[PDB]
Amino acid sequence: RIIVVALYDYEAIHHEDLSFQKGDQMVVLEESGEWWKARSLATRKEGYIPSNYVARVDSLETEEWFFKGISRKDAERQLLAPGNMLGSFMIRDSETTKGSYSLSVRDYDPRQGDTVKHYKIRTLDNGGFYISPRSTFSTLQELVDHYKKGNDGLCQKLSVPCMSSKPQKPWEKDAWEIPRESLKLEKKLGAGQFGEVWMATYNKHTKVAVKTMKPGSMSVEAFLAEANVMKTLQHDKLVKLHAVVTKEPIYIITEFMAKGSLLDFLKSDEGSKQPLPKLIDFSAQIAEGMAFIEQRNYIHRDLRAANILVSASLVCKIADFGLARVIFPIKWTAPEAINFGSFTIKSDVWSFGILLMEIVTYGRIPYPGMSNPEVIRALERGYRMPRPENCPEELYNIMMRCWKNRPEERPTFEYIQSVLDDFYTATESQYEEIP
Numbered sequence: 050r051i052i053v054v055a056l057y058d059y060e061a062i063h064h065e066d067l068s069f070q071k072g073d074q075m076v077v078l079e080e081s082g083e084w085w086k087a088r089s090l091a092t093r094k095e096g097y098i099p100s101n102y103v104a105r106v107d108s109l110e111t112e113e114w115f116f117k118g119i120s121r122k123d124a125e126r127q128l129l130a131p132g133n134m135l136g137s138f139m140i141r142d143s144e145t146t147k148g149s150y151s152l153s154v155r156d157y158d159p160r161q162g163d164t165v166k167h168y169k170i171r172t173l174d175n176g177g178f179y180i181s182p183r184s185t186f187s188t189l190q191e192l193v194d195h196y197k198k199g200n201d202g203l204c205q206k207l208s209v210p211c212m213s214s215k216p217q218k219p220w221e222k223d224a225w226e227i228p229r230e231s232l233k234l235e236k237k238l239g240a241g242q243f244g245e246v247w248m249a250t251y252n253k254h255t256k257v258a259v260k261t262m263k264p265g266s267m268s269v270e271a272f273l274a275e276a277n278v279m280k281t282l283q284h285d286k287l288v289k290l291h292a293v294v295t296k297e298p299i300y301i302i303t304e305f306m307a308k309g310s311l312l313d314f315l316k317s318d319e320g321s322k323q324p325l326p327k328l329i330d331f332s333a334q335i336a337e338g339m340a341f342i343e344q345r346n347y348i349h350r351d352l353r354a355a356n357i358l359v360s361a362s363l364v365c366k367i368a369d370f371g372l373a374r375v376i377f378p379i380k381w382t383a384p385e386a387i388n389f390g391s392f393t394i395k396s397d398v399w400s401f402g403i404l405l406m407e408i409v410t411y412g413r414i415p416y417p418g419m420s421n422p423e424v425i426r427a428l429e430r431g432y433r434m435p436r437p438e439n440c441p442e443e444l445y446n447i448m449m450r451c452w453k454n455r456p457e458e459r460p461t462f463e464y465i466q467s468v469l470d471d472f473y474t475a476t477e478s479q480y481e482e483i484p
């Protein structure tokens with residue numbers, strides 16, 4: 050008999066799913082992935098619930114200050130999000146110490162401004178917890194209550210848990226292939242050589258985006274094959290594919306990203322007011338997404354700001370991954386792909402360097418003034434785009450390493466991400482040590 054408690058309010062929108070409130074307890078009848086079958090102890094009703102909206106009773110996940118599956122960098126990002134203040138904190142799973150926990154706290158100093166500090170929490174293998182060996186607690190809540198009184202070694206006194214946000218509702222169960230009649234394409238966002246993109250509604254309850262592909266250009270059994278791989282590439286920094294209409298013309302259904310492309314966002318007014326450290330964070334998010342693709346031994350083939358999407362909370366997500374395979378733009382392309390058609394993960398690295406320049410120049414076109422054949426004649430000679438007035442030397446150095454004539458001499462995305470993530474933090478300063 051497994052009992053869970055709702056972490057957030059939820060309103061049913063399907064046939065057999067349950068509505069519930071935060072605090073509602075339920076009995077698990079079936080664990081079947083993103084959707085669980087359960088009985089509400091409040092309503093006595095049986096039905097389906099989103100598994101990531103619930104957690105077992107009195108487990109850490111029920112605590113308002115606990116954040117599961119959160120990396121140090123994500124914690125930093127979430128803590129520096131609007132709605133938070135000094136002392137805003139979170140207890141989270143340790144990234145570099147499996148099985149253990151870490152404390153992240155919002156801090157401030159006149160030199161650096163608003164910052165986030167991180168403290169290792171040590172388990173006593175018997176066993177309570179401590180950050181300082183001279184101060185030990187039975188539970189994490191006790192630790193939290195202690196440091197709420199005063200910093201006692203910490204950079205700041207603990208105040209209020211990090212502001213959280215509802216997770217996205219999971220897509221309808223067993224609805225990868227949908228009938229076209231389930232969609233209403235309401236507003237056309239853009240149109241191009243290979244098709245259009247629309248803002249749409251699925252079954253009158255879910256806002257989505259739909260990419261409509263012109264029959265051509267390309268094969269429908271080459272797409273359907275690739276589409277079953279693209280669905281397995283799930284990551285926070287890759288746009289989520291929800292569904293596909295298999296009858297030509299092909300429709301591709303994904304999550305709606307409220308702020309459109311990165312390219313358009315950088316040229317906008319809200320984008321023009323983003324400081325350099327924010328632009329670097331954008332790059333780091335994209336590198337994280339590309340490190341995932343690299344790790345899954347996949348390729349993108351069309352990396353540029355136009356194919357990066359931006360959410361309302363300024364999360365960058367990679368789009369059109371693995372679409373060029375089953376189907377402008379030589380300024381983003383590696384020499385070995387322009388000349389020999391050799392597309393690898395290393396050619397994407399070349400593309401990333403160019404994208405980096407787009408970001409730092411707020412959407413300026415690569416090689417301004419030059420032309421497509423005119424650029425190719427510059428790569429042979431060994432010409433590279435000069436450093437802009439707002440680009441740091443070390444940032445420009447990353448571009449140069451991406452722009453090596455020899456693909457083998459180009460760094461991995463795993464490395465690029467690690468550099469960009471900690472661009473402003475010395476390695477020795479990642480965690481804070483307290484006696």
Ligand SMILES: CN1CCN([C@H]2CC[C@H](n3cc(-c4ccc(Oc5ccccc5)cc4)c4c(N)ncnc43)CC2)CC1
Binds near residue numbers: 240
């Ligand atoms: C100046 N411009 C440039 C292009 N413009 C818009 C830029 C953003 C575009 N746009 C595109 C998308 C989008 C949607 C689906 C898609 O399909 C794949 C996803 C993953 C892998 C393979 C395929 C790919 C992209 C999009 C969006 N989801 N949510 C919100 N906006 C979206 C829609 C057009 C507006 C005109």
Ligand SMILES: [Ca+2]
Binds near residue numbers: 479481
């Ligand atoms: Ca340290």
Ligand SMILES: [Cl-]
Binds near residue numbers: 076088
């Ligand atoms: Cl019961």
